[PDB]
Write a protein that binds this ligand. Structure first.
Ligand SMILES: CC(=O)c1c(C)[nH]c(-c2nc3cc(N)ccc3[nH]2)c1-c1ccccc1
Length: 125
């Protein structure tokens, strides 16, 4: 069964736009999104659809690129580091839930390397 997906707005939380956050949407997210291995990560895990009934029994901080994209579009983040942490949670969740060598893990590993390449250099203020 599915929990509610992660919030993409929160009126208590202050919003911000920065050059680095703009870059994380326009270049980092939008490039990863087109990668051949992006599809498992483009939306919250649907434990019923994907027949992973234990997914949210194991993963307690779910994250996915659909959520990240919406957060960036909504100026939900205060800074780039917060957004980068969401990407890192997404990757680490995949490694936690699965096992080394699994096809889905090979997919996450290729995306993570590409992500690291793209955030190696970020715009300045
Ligand atoms: C094929 C299979 O049996 C799978 C296993 C052992 N694991 C995942 C799987 N584990 C994940 C963890 C996170 N955190 C995010 C996405 C993940 N997909 C899938 C899978 C199921 C349906 C479609 C694609 C892959």
């Amino acid at each position: 069964m599915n929990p509610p997906p992660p919030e993409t707005s929160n009126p208590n939380k202050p919003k911000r736009q920065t050059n680095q956050l703009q870059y994380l949407l326009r270049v980092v997210l939008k490039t990863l999104w087109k990668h051949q291995f992006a599809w498992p990560f483009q939306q919250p895990v649907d434990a019923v659809k994907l027949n992973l009934p234990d997914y949210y029994k194991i993963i307690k901080t779910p994250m996915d690129m659909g959520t990240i994209k919406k957060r960036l579009e909504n100026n939900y983040y205060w800074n780039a580091q917060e957004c980068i942490q969401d990407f890192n949670t997404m990757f680490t969740n995949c490694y936690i839930y699965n096992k080394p060598g699994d096809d889905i893990v090979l997919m996450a590993e290729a995306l993570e390397k590409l992500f690291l390449q793209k955030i190696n250099e970020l715009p300045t203020e």
